[PDB]
Amino acid sequence: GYVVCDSDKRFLLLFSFLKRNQKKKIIVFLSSCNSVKYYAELLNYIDLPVLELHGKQKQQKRTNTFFEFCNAERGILICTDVAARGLDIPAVDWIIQFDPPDDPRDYIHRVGRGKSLMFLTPNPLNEYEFPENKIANVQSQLEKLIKSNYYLHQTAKDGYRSYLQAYASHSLKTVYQIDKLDLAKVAKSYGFPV
Amino acid sequence: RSQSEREEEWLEKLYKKHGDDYKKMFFDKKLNIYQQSEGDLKRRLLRWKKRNG
Amino acid sequence: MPLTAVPEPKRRFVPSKNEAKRVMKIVRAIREGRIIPPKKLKEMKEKEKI
Amino acid sequence: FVRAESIVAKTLATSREKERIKRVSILEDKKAKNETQHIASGKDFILKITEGLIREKTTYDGKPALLFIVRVRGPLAVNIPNKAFKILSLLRLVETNTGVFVKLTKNVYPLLKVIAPYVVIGKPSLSSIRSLIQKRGRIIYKGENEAEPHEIVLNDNNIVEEQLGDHGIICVEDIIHEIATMGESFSVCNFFLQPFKLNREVSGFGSLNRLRKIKQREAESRTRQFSNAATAPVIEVDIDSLLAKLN
Amino acid sequence: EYSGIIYVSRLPHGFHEKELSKYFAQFGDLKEVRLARNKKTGNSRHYGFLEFVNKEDAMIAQESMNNYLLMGHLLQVRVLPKGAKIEKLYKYKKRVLVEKGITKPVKQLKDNMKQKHEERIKKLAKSGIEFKW
Amino acid sequence: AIPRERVIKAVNELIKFTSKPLLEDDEEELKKDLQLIVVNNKSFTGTSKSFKLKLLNVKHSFYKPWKEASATAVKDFKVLLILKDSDIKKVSEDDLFDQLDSEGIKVDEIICGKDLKTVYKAYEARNAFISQFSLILADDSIVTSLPKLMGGKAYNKVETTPISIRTHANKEFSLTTLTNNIKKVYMNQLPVKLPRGTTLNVHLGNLEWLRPEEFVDNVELISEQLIKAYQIRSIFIKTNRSPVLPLYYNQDVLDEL
Amino acid sequence: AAETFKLFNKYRPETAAEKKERLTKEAAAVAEGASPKPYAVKYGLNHVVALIENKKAKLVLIANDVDPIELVVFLPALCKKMGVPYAIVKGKARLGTLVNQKTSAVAALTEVRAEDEAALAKLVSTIDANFADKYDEVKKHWGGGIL
RNA sequence: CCUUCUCAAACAUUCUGUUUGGUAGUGAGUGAUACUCUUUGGAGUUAACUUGAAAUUGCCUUAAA
Secondary structure (H helix, E strand, O other), X not given: OEEOOOOOHHHHHHHHHHHHOOOOOEEEEEOOXXXXXXHHHHHHHOOOOOEEOOOOOOHHHHHHHXXXXXXXXXXXXXXXXXXXXXXXXXXXXXXXXXXXXXXXXXXXXXXXXXXXXXXXXXXXXXXXXXXXXXXXXXXXXXXXXXXXXXXXHHHHHHHHHHHHHHHHOOOOOOOOOXXXXXXXXXXXXXXXXX | OOOOHHHHHHHHHHHHHOOOXXXXXXXXXXXXXXXXXXXXXXXHHHHHHHHOO | OOOOOOXXXXXXXXXXXXXXXXXXXXXXXXXXXXXXXXXXXHHHHHOXXX | OOOHHHHHHHHHHHHHHHHHHHHHHHHHHHHHOOOOOOOOOOOOEEEEEEOOOEEOOEXXXXXXXXXXXXXXXXXXXXXXXXXXXXXHHHOOOOOOOOEEEEEEOOOHXXXXXHHOOOEEEOOOOHHHHHHHHHHOOOOOOOOOOOOOOOOOOOOOOHHXXXXXXXXXXXXXXXXHHHHHOOOOOHHHHOOOOOOEOOOOOOOOOOHHHHHHHHHHHHHHHHHOOOOXXXXXXXXXXXXXXXXXXXX | OOEEXXXXXXXXXXXXXXXXXXXXXXXXXXXXXXXXXXXXXXXXXXXXXXXXXXXXXXXXXXXHHOOEEEOOXXXXXXXXXXXXXXOOOOOOOOOOOOOOOOOOOHHHHHHHHHHHHHHHHHHHOOOXXXXXX | OOOHHHHHHHHHHHHHHHOOOOOXXXXXXXXXXXXXXXXXXXXXXXXXXXXXXXXXXXXXXXXXXXXXXXXXXXXXXXXXXXXXXXXXXXXXXXXXXXXXXXXXXXXXXXXXXXXXXXXXXXXXXXXXXXXXXXXXXXXXXXXXXXXHHOOOOOOXXXXXXXXXXXXXXXXXXXXXXXXXXXHHHHHOEEEEOOOOOOEEEEEEEEOOOOOOHHHHHHHHHHHHXXXXXXXXXXXXXXXXXXXXXXXXXXXXXXXXX | OHHHHHHHHHHOOOOHHHHHHHHHHHHHHXXXXXXXXXXXXXXXXXXXXXXXXXXXXXXXXXXXXXXXHHHOOOHHHHHHHHOOOEEEEOOHHHHHHOOOOOOOOEEEOOOOOHHHHHHHHHHHHHHHHHHHOOOOOOOOOOOOOOO
């Protein structure tokens, strides 16, 4: 149904899932195609071998990687909302959209084709009670990791920005620029909101 | 436009440890101390390879 | 947020090239022999001023 | 006025010193009673640091040896406990920059581990002893007619006759003989030259002297370590080099 | 208003009643000083209370020690109103173990162990576990 | 010799007790996993509260699958090595990987005695440093100095308290003495503390590791070494707050009381 | 002030002699037969008011005695604006000492070694409590009415 | 505003192996059944977790001027 998490504990909770669910086939959805260019660099760097799908990469790569996910057994990909339209795989158990969606109505059609949940503190199936203590302590490791690579500083820069630009180009009363930037920055690990 | 002794020996280290995996080659903290791109590395290595065998 | 959205340069993360320039200038000066190295400077005073 | 920081620092350092002295006291008590069932080590090492600083590790023999203990002033915030007051009263080393001769045996060595952060020890040579006595020397005896506490100088040999004499000692060089070579009259003359008055190193607060004290103060922690463990190896240093500095 | 009794917290590691009495004595004649400690082992809870014989002395000490960076953690001092006196804080040393053991005969405790062991085998059977011997 | 049949019956009852009818694993998984074998005595080390970890010899490694699928678990298994002030000046991490990837164990971080008293001396920085790691190894010399440098919270567990490893061949440091002793502690030994009281549990760890027939060999040899060295009272196999499983029960040690 | 400098003295910018000898050591070694970025105090007014607004400053130290007063008048209030934990310390000479200069007007501490990190964070909290809370009345009240 | 118990033997040489002994910890709190002793008092143990070193009262002098 949904999980309630703050903008600090947002990617913290996501990273906590992907390590334990390495055996399974789960789907992570983002709003921007410039957000997945960050996550599919971090997780491949910290050795959770995820797959990368976005608009900014070439079509033959977009085909030959997504094909490999269909024929896999243990795999995991990161793809956007708009790029994953029409090509859905039954080989799935968790459909977990991370960002707020494009259409609040069309997402219902996206599910009933897998288990669905959202992430909302600023904003059928059951909610999920969440332990505060057992989140992974990889934040200061990431804070050291961001300010010492440049490439991951730039991809985080255009991860944070593109996410927040898509957050402002929404239509709902819930998703209308309420979330403070002192929390949203630590999702992409910053001392200042870029 | 030739290359210096230190630059040549630096490219020796990169090729002997990695080969052609430019993603891994540029994400290495020990040899690629200056956090240079993939294009810079393949250009400089081909200059090194043309002057050698 | 900070006042300006100025992109941070590579040189703020990479080891400095001005330092590299100075080092590779002293290197030349040692090959030429016009700067005597710090290791031999001890040997020039171990033999002298006795 | 006494600042708060200092008054907590004194207690925080004496906590380490009281616990350290009790710890050494326990292991040395359990070493003597032959109840070596479960302790760290049941023997005695001596470290000899010389001059590029070689740390030797040699075990202490049962042989009686000759030591010249020199007062240091260390460590920083420490107040001396009861077990330190006792040993330093017996060796009469309450004053800083002050030396004394003692023989080292199997009874002397356990007491040496207690005072090791306060003293710097070592086996002197014949010239270190002989030059030290002919350069410095005190004799507590009567003044003109009434006054007692005069400590003057080893100027004469007839003073040596009047105070010692019948033990076989006639002159200052004979005192040097019974000090360098362990004899019968050593306990007689050792309490006759009570302590020595060594001058301090550098000996000033100013331009050159502060910087020279800085250079020597960082040389201290290199040429001397505080072990703090119950199996502390006793640090022996060159006294020929040290008294070349202190004479 | 305010009272002569003071509250001090965020005390340094090894800043006890000896040094609370000695240092705050320089501010003036103190009446009665305590420090809360653990009973399992004799060491400070890093907070204590002390009382002055002069109320004005209490406010002067508070003015000068409210934010005082002292070896890794800054002293926090607070005045108290009329009432709220210094009551029940005891000097607790390191508490040692006391060897109360044998008293009962060996045959009593043996059959007590037999009773507890046979009931122990008869305990697993109460909740879905079957185990031999 | 203890009956192996009652050990098989015990672990089978543990299988049945673990097979019973949130998005993170806060308590449910630990109470499922954590086996502890209790050992009782009349006053273990009755007056001295030393922090020595008794290295009980076991035929089969539980640390190995603890590595392999702590990789899947959120709390990662990483191997720490506390050394002395000359060792890091002499020996790098790359030599440790050179000689320990051969069998397949990984040294995560090597740590000096300097580092625990300067950089990891802040209390939250210290706690968050050690609690990350499960295997704590310390060269023989530094072990006695470590209750002060890493504090008491590091000693409240069994994981976070260090294991005394010998690295000195006749007091001279050698890499080989480290290389084989890291192996022996890892695959052939299980550490456990000794409290000043009566009760002692042995943290065997997760029930899921080493198929129950192997678990019998673990428990068997543990009893083979704890009853021989010390006279003991009682033994119980226990998953977190189960009705206990009385395994060994002695009536000849109590006669001396 | 003494406790601020007990931290700030650990980050003396490498003096001209020290830098010269080390970079000749680089030459004498590396030409014949890895390092992290080193941390130091940051000390120019163009650079400090650059670092505030980046925002990279954790403790900005400001001298009270400046030759033209008009130079550093915006700085405490710009620090209160940006959320930078500032402290107006006494003496441009005293700031000068920790920085190889005669005078410095400003000294900042951007990044830090982790050994000094907890001490710095507490130095921030001590200065917030000691300075910013005691002197909330100082944004008000025209000074110098002494009879 | 000081910084912390930074290694020893007995046997064995496979280029270092075995065995033996060595550590008394910031405080405060949350915590699910077991262990022995004691005779009612908790005595001492046994998983785990929280936390900016957090907190409201359990009956020697030249390291100076």
